[model samples]
Target chain A: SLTADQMVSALLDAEPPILYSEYDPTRPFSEASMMGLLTNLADRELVHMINWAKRVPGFVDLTLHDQVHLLECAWLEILMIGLVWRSMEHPGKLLFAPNLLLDRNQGKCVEGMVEIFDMLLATSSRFRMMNLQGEEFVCLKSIILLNSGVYTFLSSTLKSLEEKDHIHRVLDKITDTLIHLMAKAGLTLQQQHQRLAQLLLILSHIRHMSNKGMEHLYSMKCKNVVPLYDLLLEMLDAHRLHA
Target chain B: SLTADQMVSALLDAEPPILYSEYDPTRPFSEASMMGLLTNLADRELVHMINWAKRVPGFVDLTLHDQVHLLECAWLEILMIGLVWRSMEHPGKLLFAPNLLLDRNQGKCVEGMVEIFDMLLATSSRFRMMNLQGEEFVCLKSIILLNSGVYTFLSSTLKSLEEKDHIHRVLDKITDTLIHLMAKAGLTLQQQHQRLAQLLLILSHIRHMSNKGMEHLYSMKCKNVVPLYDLLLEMLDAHRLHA
Candidate 1:
């Protein structure tokens, strides 16, 4: 196993083009296709960003460290963008599952999602020239975020209603947002951070009865990048003291 | 509805206990905890630290403005801790369940956790807080990481089937680490960051992977932090050109 220092080094080495730029503030995408693609990709990252936050359900609590960890584990965020990059550059054939599962399971997307996850996770790592699992893990984590976030959005909304149709309508609305966010936002480092920032910054704003997402963010700290935890914890404390 | 700059100001206002002292880098604990926390916490406010990173996953892939926004979003990290601080100060009362499903399925241990979280998230006025449904989400997302991380550790051990109690023993050991990490590590911010530093900092060292996490350290722009990423990325990019 690598040391913490080493792991950070390893990540920096993993993708140089994205990391080292004359101007990091903006992408070099001068074309519409690139922007459009990034836009969609940013949405995907946002979905993942939201999903990452949703992991701990009102992750506004727990130890400052745990909260940071959850934020850190989102190296998956980078992994998500990386996957799209690889897929776009290398063009891996998208794996398609038959309609049988959806048809048989009454269109429950979770079942469908789980199936896709298993397939993707099981997909050969030989497709990439380097650490494919790491790259794929980030991407897989994003899709996981997509499915779970949608479910969460729906589940939360449905619980708000007393009627089945209201639940369905809300569910439909969530699905629309999911689809729109996915299709429109695209992905980018900015978008990814935007996704992360929106959830996390807003998460910091949570007061009373809503701060359930703390633990999920905590575990995320131990599992991924370290600075995020440090950065997040710093902000959390600052926010609290200010409040 | 505060502007981002105002939000940062709010955080500054909410922050508590500023202890001015010198840090002895050789002996970490000797460093003032508040300052150490403050330095790390206020990290987001300094975009130069983030901008310094050339290659940390999405670091350069985003617009400069968004990078700052990303930092702003991370204030939740501080807010999460403050939320918990209130509970520690006002102990003895049983906090209610923020999540219904987790309370039903996991027993009091889970409920205590949810309660801890609910209090944290509830401290913020920027957003509306939820109730039981939100708590269930917290449980679900956390359980997945807790469960999956444990599973991954176990599967990594399976290759050495010649080891002990088959897969079951490995499962037990890994889960114990998870539980212990959460329970013991949450005691202090320093303790938490120490563990987090290890897990997160190590990502910088992964030589065999593609992108580098070290780029983030550059954003920190501290002399001590820059070399780690610089060395690793140099090694990785030995044969390549950085953007």
Candidate 2:
């Protein structure tokens, strides 16, 4: 019986299987293939994150609808966060998927695309400034996924309220783990609190970027410029439900 | 048979039935009552907007899930637009509901609370400065509602893709009508395009505000200061689906 923190730790450590497509600066950019590859990569990560949440002690106690509800709301933000985490290792580029990469110049090809990437860069820069750790990142991912604060706002029915309470309990446990992680890392109490606030601010930016990203995605689709596939579409379909 | 534009026109002009409570300026503001009232007002507006969208020609042709999907994604922004329209009549005051009113001073009760209202004010001021009319407002609402842009992004399944095409056709009709309306208003082609972009930019601000409002709502809920009711809770629940 692993703890929720342990569950998230394991999931974060598990490397996703390799995706074959890498950035091809020479080849012409295909919207269809680009959309397809990004969605494919995203779908795999979503599944892994979902599985990770499922093991978060009490998460599975909620109705399947609520479970899906949580996943739908948080998937894109999580995807963006992971991308930022990986990309910041080497500045001026982004890991949109495990295999796919986009540099600043390549990013500009998709007009109106640079804004969201800039947001991601800003968030990554902040995370770098704070020296965010792997464990803390995992914890923040869980918090964003649960988004119990928003859940509590909406959970009016008795059943949903109960589910909301359950979510809050899980959030408490995760935060407790985060506090310990920060303490063990030799941070002062003020520093730990500052890091917590910083993580949340980044989450807000992620939310903003995700909305912008959706708009950009829609624009591309309307122009018939991208070759999008099913998994990405499904994730987006689920994503829309959160709004 | 009414044109889709005409149908939307009637729905927008139709007043909602009375909601029991209005704001009291003298009494110490009850956070619970205020939250309850705001949520109630918001819920009614959502229903009316949904009904309005349904009346749009061919909107119902899509599967029920797709119809609901569009509504969920677009409703809040539409509602905010309407509020901005109504509020512009009296500068610096917002009519969140027919009865409830919030002056700038009262709005400052919560931090960052004023910013959203300010955004709404700025949007409304811009619309007024442009001398936007009722018909254009209604048309833009429909366009925003249909938003084939988002639909194309997510139309994953075979049936959903077909449904997206159907939505695009309807949006095309509405946009054409909007263009003609602008033309009749004695605007040049460049002005028409400029106004359209301006409207969408305001929408982006609305999106930004809605996310901020959610944070505000969550903060209130956690503090147990506001008494939020069920339908509003449900709306908030559905709204969170987007993030």
Candidate 3:
């Protein structure tokens, strides 16, 4: 359970991604077209992410409510990083699936989404050029996903310091694993810790996407042209409650 | 679960083997030296084998008692082929653990055991020379372990025909999966079925090894030279009652 050691074990044991998607290009246009495509796509990866997050060591050790809330709050950012990782190499278009790509222009099919798409597209290219090692992607993604401090719910249920202390230690433990990776990649010095700071700082950029992404999703959702079901409804509906 | 599709799914999803072993030759000698080492080695792998067999799709579909008995009866032969598979590539000694090896001369250390070793060693070569693929060995071993027809207990239950038919369909299903592998390797026609016939026909040769391996193990047990426990005691003790 040493955070550094097991960091990649989850990746090593990682399940095959949910490759099946309901996105249809020939179908009609509505915000549902884009919302539904992404909802459908995110639902696949989000479904997959829930399974992966639960199996991460110490994830379930928190209160059951915290676990559910942790997933709810973090699912968007987790899916964003994974989407960035998959498309990072392609450069010009967002590679959502093997057959699907959206140029920044095609993103216009949905009104408010272009803002969300362009920012996310920029973030993908930003990390894209970094030439991140797969292990780094795994560690970096996990730190954001599993770091309990990010979940406002932890504050909602805490000797906030006790919960905060638990989170910081988890942060350091997993954070050091990123060091193990970076140190091996040949960066070192107090400067190395600075670079670790740089990546975690990049989290804010992704953190913003979850907000606008949720916002537009909530905005378009009112038109109710299509439908939301299962995990999509619960996760997206969850945001509406707070909004 | 159509048997054939899942046949390799188990292999694709197979867990890592238990590499840890209690075998230590420098400690000294007794039959426990060999029995202890093997019992220890078998115990490690047996622990792993039980977990594996449990996950094999329909294995638990049988009665809970049947699941236990299925593993108990087949563990020896399951282990035998795995033993043969691991050592198959490196002839002349049994690679029971990474650090340990035993020759035909080393077989002399245990009495009637030499017969068991020579038989096993010969059988290993027979299959060894056949140049079996790993998938074939997996299918072959599961066929024997899960066939359920061999355990004699199926006959112990009535309307034995029902159990027999259930097992026969299981056999045909898995048997065709073996056909899938063989046909892909570029075999065809009744000739392919006959070739499938040829590999399975080799199982009887392995089938004999478990009987004598159990016999010599029981013979050694009376001396009480080394202890048998857990899976070892129960699997071996099981034969004692049937005798």
Candidate 4:
């Protein structure tokens, strides 16, 4: 049996290879193509995270409703944080998926998008400065996914009491394990506070990017050509879980 | 028969009064109570927006599915922007709905939430600086709602071509009307650019707040006390229009 950190590492490292169109400054890509690439990347991450959580001792113990609840709320935030971490090795450009490279100007196609890229770059610089490790990144991702307060999938019609507590207990143990791992990383108290601040900044940027990405997808869909997979569609639904 | 500006004003001014708990520093409200209040306020806005959209000249011409597609993608973004406009009357506090006001320190229950509030305040200040009017706010909201390119509700089975083009035409006219209004606002080209940048910042901040708000609701639901109205739940799900 693998330990907790090893399990998370396995999930993080299991991302499948993504096929993306190479960035060409003058050759503009259609919105459909871009949305297609993004949806594919998002689909793979969702599958990997679900696989990781299945290995958690108590996660599968929760009702299927509760399981869907946690994933819908946490998926985008986790994806965003992972994107920032992946792009940290490079500066001034956002390395999306494996093949797509979008620079600041490419980000400026929409109104008021230039500043978002600037904020993303600043966040990347901080991650580089802190020397974030694989274990720490996985830990933070796990915590964010587990800590969401709102369950978009929760319905009054479901009408259960103990299921909530059961899910909470599962998340609680996962969180405690993560805290223990963080403490063992040897960061001083002040360093922890500084690092927490940086993580928050990165999360904020990720939310903005996701919103922009959603808008782009909306545009592509309206154009009637973007082919979205079932998993991606199910994930995007804010209220009900068709899956 | 209303002019374009008058029509926009009619929608903006039609908001009903909201009931809310007054802010009290000595009174520490439970997470359930706060979520309840926020949910109530969100419900009212959703209703008002729906009624307002129904009055759009050609809106009812589209099939029910298409109408829902527009709303699901655009509602949260519209609601967030409207909140800023509504609260621009005061600074340093968020005047939610009609009665409740949330101060900064009170918003710190969730980790890394203070920065979200700060971003909101800054966005509100910029709106005030530009002296944004109800007409502009409504116009922006209409455009945002009608121009949603990525339809979360759009299904693979419901393949149609003319519906897309029809909705695009409606949004195109709305966009033209908004541009004419911006020209009527009488600012130099540079001021227009600055205002657009500020609007983008506000839109970006609104998306973050909506995401955070959902997480809060998710947490509350896990505890089984979230009083989500059917309208709110229906509005949230993009696949079908329960409303």
Backbone collision count in every prediction?
Answer: 89, 11, 0, 12
Q: What would you estimate as the lDDT of candidate 1?
A: 0.29
lDDT (Cα, 0-100) at A223 in candidate 4: 28
Q: What tens-digit string does per-residue lDDT give for candidate 4 at A95-125? A: 7756676677776655555655565665565
Interface RMSD of each: 19.2, 18.1, 30.3, 16.3
Best by TM-score: 2
Per-residue CA lDDT of model 2 for A148-230, tens digit only, reads 22322334579876776676556656655666676778877545543443354355456667766765665574323333333
Docking class of 1: incorrect
Using DockQ, give the best candidate's number. Answer: 4
Q: Give the CA lDDT, 0 to 100, for residue A92 in model 4.
A: 68
Better of 1 and 2 by lDDT: 2
lDDT of 1 by residue, A69-122 (tens): 434434343333343333432333321111111111222232233333232222
Candidate 1: regions farther than 4 A off: A1-32, A40-243, B1-172, B176-226, B229-243
Give per-model TM-scores. 0.22, 0.47, 0.43, 0.45
Worst 10 residues of 4 chain A by lDDT: A147-156
Best by lDDT: 3
TM-score of 2: 0.47
The best-first sequence of candidates by TM-score reads: 2, 4, 3, 1
lDDT of 3 by residue, A123-217 (tens): 77657655777787776676666542232332433554455446545655666676677777787443344445435535645654665576566
